Write a protein that binds this ligand. Structure first.
Ligand SMILES: [Cl-]
Ligand SMILES: [Cl-]
Lengths: 201, 212, 125
């Protein structure tokens, strides 16, 4: 019940995913659809699978190898083992597209007047960028916040292969009016120095 | 040819029960095994249980004392009885076909795995009640906050604006309600053309058009 | 019942001999047949043997490469597999029927009522 790992690669690269105790069956799953079987019995190819996929055993571990990566090969790959009575699925490796670094466009939004009447206020901090690693730090009158904000990252875009993040700071109307300055400090790989977008209540 | 159709999923209170159905067709039901594999929102695959039509059953240690799998050989359908459901069991439940004696065939050189999978069914375990969303205006956008359950679809100008639009995946707030934002970048010289985001919540019959 | 032994990881072009041990009354058995089932494919018959005469019947996919024989002293039917290709990778079951079917249907799964647990055979690259 864990989150898959990442692996950046471009079209035409050679990817070898290692699985970490019986034989390993490899599965490919695209987002929003059912998984598909690729390799069974360590190194036997399933029917209809392209010949670029291949499995191999290395001592005690098992590896899935894509000789030449293709555009339709970007998905999550799971390895499945079978014990005496329990079938277990691996962590899963999500192969993403590699792109030049891109800095995000930072935007901040104060809560609307139609929202303050409900009793709660939400401040949204908007971040297209690459890679996925980014830090969003909320500041309320130069007081570091933590725990009262949630992040949401979109999937890799189909045209430019970039990510989009949204951090929503949730506060009550009583606590929102008790302060003046609200800011979200963004730290990204493509930025030599952090960028801060702020506003006053 | 071979087809596996899941059904029975829905909404259930914490502590309730729900029976899932895996209607199989296109093969000899007695010569294979039917497994249940769930997948939490944004996480990996988790095997739950299996049955071999011989009552060869097995359960994962996380659903031992509250899940029960059965089958009906005359209907070619497998059943998964889930009792004492908790918030951790919220996932998309697939059923797949495997070898009949996979425990006996499992060795250091063989692992047939699961050949045919179904599109799965959604099972949501939450104590929250169905509630419509409250849209607030926010590059511009509109905030869709506090609604239940999934899903919701946001469009701009009745689907006219789709290039450069980002509708973020919903996140489960600590209060049990969903919330997401939909942003879109437009030229600055066209601010003073109107922009309307279209929010539709089918599990509650709520359509809201807010002008930004 | 029927117990399948042998089988394992074999390189392409090698040879492999499978064994099917039987116990109890086998005099009323009409056909002893090997079946194999690969992931995604349907269970197919490869080699059938008529116990009362000794005639063998092979499929077109395994003609000239597989040899089936019966050792009536120990009541064990063998499946000698030669020149294995990666397409032969499957679980090889041992089937038997006490109801009689013609030679036309001697390689169909529906003509056999008794099966063994089967042994897996992998042809790795
Ligand atoms: Cl069948
Ligand atoms: Cl298996």
């Amino acid at each position: 019940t864990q989150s898959p790992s990442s692996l950046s690669a471009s079209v035409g690269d050679r990817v070898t995913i290692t699985c970490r105790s019986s034989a390993v069956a490899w599965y490919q799953q695209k987002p929003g659809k059912a998984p598909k079987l690729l390799i069974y019995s360590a190194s036997s190819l399933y029917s209809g699978v392209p010949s670029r996929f291949s499995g191999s055993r290395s001592g005690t571990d098992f590896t899935l190898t894509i000789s030449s990566l293709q555009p339709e090969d970007f998905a999550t790959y799971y390895c499945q083992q079978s014990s005496s009575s329990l079938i277990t699925f691996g962590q899963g490796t999500k192969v993403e597209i590699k792109r030049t670094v891109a800095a995000p466009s930072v935007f901040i939004f104060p809560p609307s007047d139609s929202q303050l009447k409900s009793g709660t206020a939400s401040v949204v901090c908007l971040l297209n960028f690459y890679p996925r690693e980014a830090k969003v730090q909320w500041k309320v009158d130069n007081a570091l916040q933590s725990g009262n904000s949630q992040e949401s990252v979109t999937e890799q875009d189909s045209k430019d292969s970039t990510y989009s993040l949204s951090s929503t700071l949730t506060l009550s109307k009583a606590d929102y009016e008790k302060h003046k300055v609200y800011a979200c400090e963004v730290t990204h790989q493509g930025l030599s120095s952090p960028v801060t977008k702020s506003f006053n209540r | 040819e071979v087809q596996l159709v899941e059904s029975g999923g829905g909404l259930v209170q914490p502590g309730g029960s729900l029976r899932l159905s895996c209607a199989a067709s296109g093969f000899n039901f007695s010569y294979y095994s039917i497994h249940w594999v769930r997948q939490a929102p944004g996480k990996g695959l988790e095997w739950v249980a299996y049955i071999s039509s011989s009552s060869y059953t097995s359960y994962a240690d996380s659903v031992k004392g509250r899940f029960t799998i059965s089958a009906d050989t005359s209907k070619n359908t497998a059943y998964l009885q889930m009792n004492s459901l908790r918030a951790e069991d919220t996932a998309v439940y697939y059923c797949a076909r495997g070898y009949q004696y996979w425990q006996y065939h499992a060795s250091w050189y063989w692992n047939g795995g699961l050949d045919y999978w179904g599109q799965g069914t959604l099972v949501t375990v939450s104590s929250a009640s169905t509630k419509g969303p409250s849209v607030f205006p926010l590059a511009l956008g509109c905030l869709v906050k506090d609604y239940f359950p999934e899903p919701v679809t946001v469009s701009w100008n009745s689907g006219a604006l789709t290039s450069g639009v980002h509708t973020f995946p919903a996140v489960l707030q600590s209060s049990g309600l969903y919330s997401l934002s939909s942003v879109v970048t437009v030229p600055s010289s066209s601010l003073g053309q109107t922009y309307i985001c279209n929010v539709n919540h089918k599990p509650s019959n709520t359509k809201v058009d807010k002008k930004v | 019942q029927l117990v399948e032994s042998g089988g394992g990881l074999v390189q392409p072009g090698g040879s492999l001999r499978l064994s099917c041990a039987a116990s109890g009354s086998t005099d009323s058995i009409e056909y002893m047949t090997w079946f194999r089932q690969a992931p995604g494919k349907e269970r197919e018959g490869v080699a059938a043997l008529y116990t009362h005469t000794g005639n063998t019947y092979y499929a077109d996919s395994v003609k000239g490469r597989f040899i089936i024989s019966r050792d009536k002293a120990k009541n064990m039917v063998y499946l000698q597999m030669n020149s294995l290709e990666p397409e032969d990778t499957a679980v090889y079951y041992c089937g038997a029927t006490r109801k009689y079917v013609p030679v036309r249907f001697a390689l169909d799964q529906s003509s056999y009522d008794y099966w063994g647990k089967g042994t897996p055979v992998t042809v790795s690259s």
